[PDB]
């Protein structure tokens, strides 16, 4: 059928005219296929023969359908598409299973010839004109235009979905207890009715759909739960990811590893603790895709843990709108966070992992706070609600960091949970200069054209020193100079620098870094008992700055 629903008005982009593309010659047998097919379609109303006036045209062709002996009709809508207006994005956003509510019974209905069942804006049909070529392209071809949504035209996905949504609205309005999801040409329908009345509601809906031009599978042809959908296995009362088989191989290609990382990342939505750090380091660099990468020790072991976590089926539950959500986060290892979200411990609605560096230097308290933020946004999308958090950090630790850190922050209601490793601050810089502690005036420098650097210090106790560095930068020498003061100093030390760069880094209390220097400087700060760090304007001629500026 062709739905009786009203059409969506459409037009070409503002300056443009419709397509005028020449139909190329086709082989005789493709010409025969097209004639039979367009004859079928024409008798269904799908297309109409058009007069000589219509100046627009769009090429067409025919292909032998799969491994069968029927043909398909393909239209090339490139030109028309480039000239057609933009539409509302079909709809961007897929429901996550963990957001779905438990259902007693669920059914899938398959919409027949979806696109060809919806009418095309009458004013627009003329621009869909196409021509079936005569043999050897000797005589004028048979010309047609579409009356329905062509397959392949820019606007069909969006006008179809809108048409369905509009058709469904009465049904939804008279059936609020019932749940329906539109994806492409599929409808899924959930109820908390028993098999009997549910089957009855499905028929009223089919009748309603057929009243509107849309044919569906009979009570016999509707697929059974559990369904595969978007990589998921849905059951009425639980959900999981669809089967994931990790291959047994002696040799892993770059392509094998990427795909393995992909499946593992996918499974981590519901399999707790999946890790891919070690496998991911392998992907590092830049081989060819067919290149073999021997697994490291810590990668072959990582595969081991994962293969274990997966050996047994795991499902997530569905969302109860009446209850709070609880999110728990653990530090796995090196910048790797994992988390679980549940309403009844420990039946997870879903799990996940967070592993991102924001900047070259951070600390566990920053990273934890970022995972919290990532999880909060995710909860808003999936449930429209923020979770209550349980975090491996003491309220005192987090309150110490937040207050004295210069960036603003905030995380929703949370409370301490003792799941080691606990996140902590590994050292605190002093807030006032230290008495009885040597003052190191440090300074580092680099000649831009040489890549040569000197780094050094003078102290109030008269200690002095300079070390030469090669291929270094200004930024590096300033960090080396502070590193030097740290190595040569006692457990308490004041350090005066003119590098805002160095001060920024260290004052942020990093506990890990991409820089070897900074990692050492950090290792050094853990050892100290008290470090006070001070900044001074360079070259302003300051008592101690001037001194070690003359040496380096």
Ligand X SMILES: Cc1cc(/C=C/C#N)cc(C)c1Nc1ccnc(Nc2ccc(C#N)cc2)n1
Distance CA 495, CA 377 (A): 42
Which one of other proteins, ligand X, none interacts with residue 106, CB within 5 to 8 A by kind? ligand X
Asked if 100 is part of the footprint of ligand X (rule: CB under 6 A), the reply reads: yes
Q: How far apart are CA 319 and CA 98, in angstroms?
A: 6
250 is in an annotated binding site: no
Instruction: Check: CB of residue 159 under 8 Å from CB of residue 149.
Output: yes
Check the CA dihedral 170-174-175-176 and report its sign: positive
Beta bridge partners of 341: 327, 350
- Evaluated on CA atoms 13, 16, 18, 19, the torsion sign reads negative
Joined together, the tokens standing for residue 481 give: 């100079």
Q: Is 260 in the site for other proteins (CB under 8 A)?
A: no
**245 binds other proteins, rule: CB under 8 A:** no
Q: Tell me which residue of 416, 460, 453 sits closest to 434, measured CA to CA.
A: 460
Residue 484 binds what, of ligand X, other proteins, none (CB under 5 to 8 Å, by partner type)? none
Binding to other proteins by CB under 8 A, coded x per residue (else -) over 425-444, reads -------xxxx---x-x---
**3-state SS class at 344:** strand
Q: For 386, what's the count of Cα atoms within 13 Å in the CB-facing half-sphere?
A: 13
In order of 65, 340, 402, the CA distances from 366 in angstroms are 56, 20, 10
Q: For residue 190, how many other CB atoms are within 10 A of its CB?
A: 20
Residue 435 binding partner per list other proteins, ligand X, none, with a CB distance cut-off of 5 to 8 Å that depends on partner kind: other proteins
Side-chain half-sphere exposure of 356, counting CA atoms within 13 A: 11
Residue 247 CB, nearest approach to ligand X (Å): 27
With contacts defined by CB under 6 A, name the span among 29-37, 222-230, 473-481, 531-539 that binds ligand X. Answer: 222-230
- The three-class DSSP label of residue 279 is helix
In terms of CB distance, is 95 or 152 closer to other proteins?
Answer: 95
Rounded CA-CA distance 508/512 in Å is: 11
Of the two residues 403 and 418, which places its CB atom closer to other proteins in the complex? 403
Binding segment (CB under 6 A) for ligand X, from list 103-111, 196-204, 279-287, 442-450: 103-111
Site membership for other proteins, residue 485 (CB under 8 A)? no
Taking the C-alpha atoms of residue 496 and residue 514, their distance in angstroms, rounded to an integer, is 24
- Which residues, 305 to 334, sit near ligand X by CB under 6 A? 318
Binding mask 172-191 for ligand X (x = CB under 6 A): -------x-x------xxx-
Residues 292-351 that bind other proteins (CB under 8 A): none
The interface with other proteins within residues 72-101 (CB under 8 A) comprises 85-89, 91-96, 99-100
Instruction: Report the partner that residue 88 touches, choosing among ligand X, other proteins, none (CB closer than 5 to 8 A by kind).
Output: other proteins
Q: Is there binding between residue 361 and ligand X (CB under 6 A)? A: no
Contact of residue 270 among ligand X, other proteins, none (CB under 5-8 Å per partner type): none
Interface residue with other proteins, options 458, 481, 485, 486 (CB under 8 A): 458
Question: Nearest approach, Cβ of 174 to ligand X (angstroms)?
Answer: 18
As annotated, the binding site includes: 110, 185-186, 443, 478, 498, 549
List residues binding ligand X (CB under 6 A): 95, 100-101, 103, 106, 108, 179, 181, 188-190, 225-227, 229, 234-236, 318
């Amino acid at each position: 059928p062709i739905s009786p629903i009203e059409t969506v008005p459409v037009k070409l982009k503002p300056g443009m005219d419709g397509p005028k593309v020449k139909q190329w010659p086709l082989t005789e047998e493709k010409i025969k296929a097209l004639v039979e097919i367009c004859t079928e379609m024409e008798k269904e109303g799908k297309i109409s023969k058009i007069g000589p006036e219509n100046p627009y045209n769009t090429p067409v062709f025919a292909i032998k359908k799969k491994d069968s002996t029927k043909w398909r009709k393909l239209v090339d809508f490139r030109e028309l598409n480039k000239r057609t207006q933009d539409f509302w994005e079909v709809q961007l956003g897929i429901p996550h299973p963990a957001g779905l509510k438990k259902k007693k019974s669920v059914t899938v209905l398959d919409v027949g010839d979806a696109y060809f069942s919806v009418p095309l804006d009458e004013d627009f049909r003329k621009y869909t004109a196409f021509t079936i070529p005569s043999i050897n392209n000797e005589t004028p071809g048979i010309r047609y235009q579409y009356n329905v949504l062509p397959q392949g035209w820019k606007g069909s996905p969006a006008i179809f979905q809108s048409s369905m949504t509009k058709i469904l609205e009465p049904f939804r309005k008279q059936n609020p207890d019932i749940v329906i999801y539109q994806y492409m040409d599929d409808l899924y329908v959930g109820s908390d009715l028993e098999i009997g009345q549910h089957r009855t509601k499905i028929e009223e809906l089919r009748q309603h759909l057929l009243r509107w031009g849309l044919t569906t599978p009979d009570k016999k042809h509707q697929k059974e739960p559990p369904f595969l959908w978007m990589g998921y296995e849905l059951h009425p009362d639980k959900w999981t990811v669809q089967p994931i088989v990790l291959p047994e191989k002696d040799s892993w290609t770059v392509n094998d590893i990427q795909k393995l990382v992909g499946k593992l990342n996918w499974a981590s939505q519901i399999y707790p603790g999946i890790k891919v750090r070690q496998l991911c380091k392998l992907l590092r660099g830049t081989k060819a895709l067919t290149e073999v990468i021997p697994l490291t020790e810590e990668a072959e072991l990582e595969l081991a843990e994962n293969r274990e976590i997966l050996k047994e089926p795991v499902h997530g539950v569905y969302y109860d709108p009446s209850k709070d959500l609880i999110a728990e986060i653990q530090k796995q290892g090196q910048g790797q966070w994992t988390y679980q979200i549940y309403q009844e411990p420990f039946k997870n609605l879903k799990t996940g992992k967070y592993a991102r560096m924001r900047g070259a230097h951070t600390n566990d308290v920053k990273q934890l706070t970022e995972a919290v933020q990532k999880i909060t946004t995710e909860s808003i999308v999936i449930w429209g609600k923020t979770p209550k958090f349980k975090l491996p950090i003491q309220k005192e630790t987090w309150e110490t960091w937040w207050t004295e850190y210069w960036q603003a922050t905030w995380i929703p209601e949370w409370e301490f949970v003792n799941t080691p490793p606990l996140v902590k601050l590994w050292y605190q810089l002093e807030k006032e200069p230290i008495v009885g502690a040597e003052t190191f005036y440090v300074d580092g420098a680099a000649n831009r054209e040489t890549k040569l650097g000197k780094a050094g210090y003078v102290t109030n106790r008269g200690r002095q020193k300079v070390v030469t560095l090669t291929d270094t930068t200004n930024q590096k020498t300033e960090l080396q100079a502070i590193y030097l003061a740290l190595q040569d100093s006692g457990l308490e030390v004041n350090i005066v620098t003119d590098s805002q760069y160095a001060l920024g880094i260290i004052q942020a209390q990093p506990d890990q870094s991409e820089s070897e220097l900074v990692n050492q400087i950090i290792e050094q700060l853990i050892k100290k008992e008290k470090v006070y760090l001070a900044w001074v304007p360079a070259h302003k001629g300051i008592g101690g700055n001037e001194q070690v500026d003359k040496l380096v």
